Amino acid sequence: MDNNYHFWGNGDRQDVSLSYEDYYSILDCLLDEKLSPQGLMKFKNLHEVSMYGVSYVPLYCFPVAYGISHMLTGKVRRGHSGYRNLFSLMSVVLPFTCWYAYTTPIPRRLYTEIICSNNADGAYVRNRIKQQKPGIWRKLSQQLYNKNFRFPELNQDLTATEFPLDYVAPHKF
Amino acid sequence: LFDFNPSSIKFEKYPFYYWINSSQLTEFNQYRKFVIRDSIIYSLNNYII
Amino acid sequence: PGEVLPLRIIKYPLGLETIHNNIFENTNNEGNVELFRLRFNSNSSKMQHK
Amino acid sequence: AQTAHQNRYQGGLCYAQCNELFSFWNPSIQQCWKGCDFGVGRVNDPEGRIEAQQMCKRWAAELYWTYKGELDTIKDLRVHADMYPTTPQNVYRACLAGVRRQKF
Amino acid sequence: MDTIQKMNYEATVNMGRQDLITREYTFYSDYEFIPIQEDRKQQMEDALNNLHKIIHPTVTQLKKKANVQEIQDRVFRKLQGWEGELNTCVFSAKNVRDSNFCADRFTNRINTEGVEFVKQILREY
Amino acid sequence: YSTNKEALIQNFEPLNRKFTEEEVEQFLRNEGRSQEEKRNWIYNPHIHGSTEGEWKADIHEKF
Numbered sequence: 001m002d003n004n005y006h007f008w009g010n011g012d013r014q015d016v017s018l019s020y021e022d023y024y025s026i027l028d029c030l031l032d033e034k035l036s037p038q039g040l041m042k043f044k045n046l047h048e049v050s051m052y053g054v055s056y057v058p059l060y061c062f063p064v065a066y067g068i069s070h071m072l073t074g075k076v077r078r079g080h081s082g083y084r085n086l087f088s089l090m091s092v093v094l095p096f097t098c099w100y101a102y103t104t105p106i107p108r109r110l111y112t113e114i115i116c117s118n119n120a121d122g123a124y125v126r127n128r129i130k131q132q133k134p135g136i137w138r139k140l141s142q143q144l145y146n147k148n149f150r151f152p153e154l155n156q157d158l159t160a161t162e163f164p165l166d167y168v169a170p171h172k173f
Numbered sequence: 174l175f176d177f178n179p180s181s182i183k184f185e186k187y188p189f190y191y192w193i194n195s196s197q198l199t200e201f202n203q204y205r206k207f208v209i210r211d212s213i214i215y216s217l218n219n220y221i222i
Numbered sequence: 223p224g225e226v227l228p229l230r231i232i233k234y235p236l237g238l239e240t241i242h243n244n245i246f247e248n249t250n251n252e253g254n255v256e257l258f259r260l261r262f263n264s265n266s267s268k269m270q271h272k
Numbered sequence: 273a274q275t276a277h278q279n280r281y282q283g284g285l286c287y288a289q290c291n292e293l294f295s296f297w298n299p300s301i302q303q304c305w306k307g308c309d310f311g312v313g314r315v316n317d318p319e320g321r322i323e324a325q326q327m328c329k330r331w332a333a334e335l336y337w338t339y340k341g342e343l344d345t346i347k348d349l350r351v352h353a354d355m356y357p358t359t360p361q362n363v364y365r366a367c368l369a370g371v372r373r374q375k376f
Numbered sequence: 377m378d379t380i381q382k383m384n385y386e387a388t389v390n391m392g393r394q395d396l397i398t399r400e401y402t403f404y405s406d407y408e409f410i411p412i413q414e415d416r417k418q419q420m421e422d423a424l425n426n427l428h429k430i431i432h433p434t435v436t437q438l439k440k441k442a443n444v445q446e447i448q449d450r451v452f453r454k455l456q457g458w459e460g461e462l463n464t465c466v467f468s469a470k471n472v473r474d475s476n477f478c479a480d481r482f483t484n485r486i487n488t489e490g491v492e493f494v495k496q497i498l499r500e501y
Numbered sequence: 502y503s504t505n506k507e508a509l510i511q512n513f514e515p516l517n518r519k520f521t522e523e524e525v526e527q528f529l530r531n532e533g534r535s536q537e538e539k540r541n542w543i544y545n546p547h548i549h550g551s552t553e554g555e556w557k558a559d560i561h562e563k564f
């Protein structure tokens with residue numbers, strides 16, 4: 001528990017977790033005219049954080065890919081002599097590690113604020129993700145229901161008078 | 174790798190199931206010219222049924 | 223492409239003209255300034271003049 | 273360019289006050305300096321201050337096309353950092369601010 | 377009239393008659409909807425005029441354009457929320473009856489919800 | 502210490518009421534009030550009602 005829990009870019013263990021790919025996909029189906037200035041500021045701060053985060057992700061993945069490439073080459077560490085094979089084979093191993101990292105969702109205070117806000121901006125973003133990005137919204141709604149968030153857009157809504165628009169995954173009642 | 178992971182199951186058989194036309198549930202904040210998209214989705218659903 | 227929708231709500235720009243220090247330029251017949259306008263489309267199967 | 277001093281440092285405290293009042297990229301600093309020059313030797317007189325204000329009105333009118341009554345009907349005469357001399361009203365407000373800042 | 381007056385009148389009428397000559401040209405592969413009726417057009421115009429009448433005092437009293445712009449943006453978002461529904465329903469409307477129903481729903485929603493929201497935000501300001 | 506203790510014990514009396522609707526509404530309306538600069542109150546008949554003078558008097562009394 002660091003000493004910067006106030007920081008917007010920071011996150012908590014139980015905060016809403018969203019992948020970088022999911023965030024970039026969500027950016028596609030949103031319009032700035034339909035967001036309040038506060039929501040626009042939230043999105044701008046989120047982009048400010050993501051600008052550094054996306055670039056740093058390969059930095060985080062580098063050691064794992066380097067170790068995997070060494071293991072693939074063998075049990076011999078030949079230093080400069082093996083750089084050609086190490087970085088030719090690592091040129092495909094590191095993309096796999098970055099793929100896994102990007103598919104891995106990470107919690108963020110900005111993510112939870114933008115998604116779970118109980119205002120017009122929150123409703124708008126949730127509805128846009130539900131309509132234009134059903135695949136992402138299914139997982140997002142499952143996560144929200146598991147984390148005890150109740151909204152009319154959630155497919156797991158037990159007090160709704162209209163049938164869900166997507167498959168409801170198994171969960172504990 | 175240790176906590177709850179949302180399921181990836183989805184409908185694989187019903188055609189055009191995920192072409193969700195605008196309605197009260199999804200609000201009406203979509204791209205303005207998606208009226209034609211909604212009409213086409215309605216026509217496709219009618220043809221299927 | 224996509225046809226002109228039946229109705230459009232258009233915001234009146236504010237502050238374009240600073241003459242005589244009047245932010246609002248459109249006034250309704252009843253004597254009240256207008257912030258929004260409704261534009262209606264008829265005969266969608268028609269060209270738009272150049 | 274149109275001020276009374278070959279550089280802003282030759283001008284007294286009024287130029288520094290204008291620089292503080294307006295942002296470094298805001299060209300209304302020049303109009304504030306013009307107001308300072310107009311107010312030189314007049315601010316300390318009740319009639320001199322009004323004469324300097326009339327000089328500001330004339331300066332704005334000669335800088336930009338204007339109608340009779342705009343400067344009299346200006347709503348707010350206060351100036352903010354991001355106010356630019358794009359209108360006679362803005363020019364007149366900057367000149368008035370410079371006249372107010374002028375001490376002697 | 378004189379020659380100059382006749383030329384000016386001809387110019388004005390020709391500028392006004394753009395629709396007259398653009399009507400004849402129509403496209404086949406077009407998604408054609410039923411236009412909203414004139415009565416419903418007038419009703420919606422009257423509703424907007426009522427909203428403007430409600431809003432006029434506060435906006436006139438306000439002296440900074442920023443607050444006026446904020447009020448305009450909020451009210452525009454609220455109105456566009458219902459405008460999307462109106463357009464979607466009218467485009468899918470299969471008869472003038474459906475078009476009139478959609479227009480009536482839109483104007484009633486304005487008169488109640490938009491009036492309440494405008495009063496609330498104006499009081500807040 | 503003696504004077505502070507005596508004053509506190511003498512003048513302390515818990516509020517034995519329930520805040521009324523008017524008090525709650527005024528507390529909510531007091532979000533943006535500030536004494537640095539007085540608010541410019543503007544009378545809109547369509548949202549305030551009554552008469553301009555009465556509304557101004559009530560606003561002056563309240564804030």
Ligand SMILES: CCCCCCCCCCCCCCCCCC(=O)OC[C@H](COP(=O)([O-])OCC(O)COP(=O)([O-])OC[C@@H](COC(=O)CCCCCCCCCCCCCCCCC)OC(=O)CCCCCCCCCCCCCCCCC)OC(=O)CCCCCCCCCCCCCCCCC
Nearest residue numbers: 055056058059060061062063066077078079080081083087
């Ligand atoms: C004067 C007196 C004063 C008074 C006091 C007294 C003082 C007395 C003296 C004090 C002396 C103290 C120091 C003691 C000695 C220390 C010696 C030492 O450290 O070297 C030993 C060290 C290993 O020890 P060794 O015993 O010699 O060899 C061990 C074996 O040979 C086995 O090794 P190997 O052959 O198996 O492997 C070697 C190496 C061979 O391979 C390479 O060299 C890799 C080349 C490609 C790298 C990737 C592309 C280029 C860089 C991109 C960087 C992008 C991100 C930048 C982020 C910046 C902001 C954080 O592979 C690696 O191990 C890779 C590690 C480095 C990765 C690159 C680091 C990038 C910056 C950090 C990013 C975050 C980390 C994770 C991500 C890492 C990947 C980016 O030698 C080296 O090989 C040195 C490598 C140096 C790499 C530098 C990369 C720089 C990249 C450019 C700059 C990026 C921006 C930086 C910020 C902005 C400003 C520029």
Ligand SMILES: CCCCCCCCCCCCCCCCCC(=O)OC[C@H](COP(=O)([O-])OCC(O)COP(=O)([O-])OC[C@@H](COC(=O)CCCCCCCCCCCCCCCCC)OC(=O)CCCCCCCCCCCCCCCCC)OC(=O)CCCCCCCCCCCCCCCCC
Nearest residue numbers: 055058079080081082083084085086087088089090091092
């Ligand atoms: C955020 C930055 C990073 C982003 C990376 C993103 C991924 C990009 C990948 C693109 C390519 C696909 C992957 C290919 C994998 C290949 C694996 C392999 O076998 O290669 C390793 C292989 C190992 O060689 P070796 O035979 O074992 O001998 C090395 C020894 O063991 C001695 O070992 P050492 O440790 O002392 O030094 C060896 C070092 C040597 O390499 C380095 O130190 C470079 C490390 C940074 C790589 C950056 C990639 C490109 C990023 C975009 C461009 C940004 C600007 C880059 C500026 C620096 C030059 C790269 O090797 C490495 O760093 C290992 C990793 C290299 C990865 C592949 C690099 C592709 C370079 C493509 C451009 C080449 C032409 C550039 C011309 C200059 C343009 C300004 O080395 C290379 O093939 C790299 C050659 C780099 C040549 C740089 C030439 C610089 C310019 C000098 C002349 C300037 C003339 C100016 C004339 C005008 C004056 C007015």
Ligand SMILES: Nc1ncnc2c1ncn2[C@@H]1O[C@H](COP(=O)(O)OP(=O)(O)OP(=O)(O)O)[C@@H](O)[C@H]1O
Nearest residue numbers: 237238239240354355356357358359362440441442
């Ligand atoms: N319609 C316009 N015509 C000319 N200049 C303009 C106009 N709108 C803005 N400007 C210039 O941009 C500056 C900043 O504009 P801004 O949006 O802050 O104006 P405002 O809110 O109407 O009030 P103010 O006059 O205090 O700037 C104005 O001072 C003026 O220099």
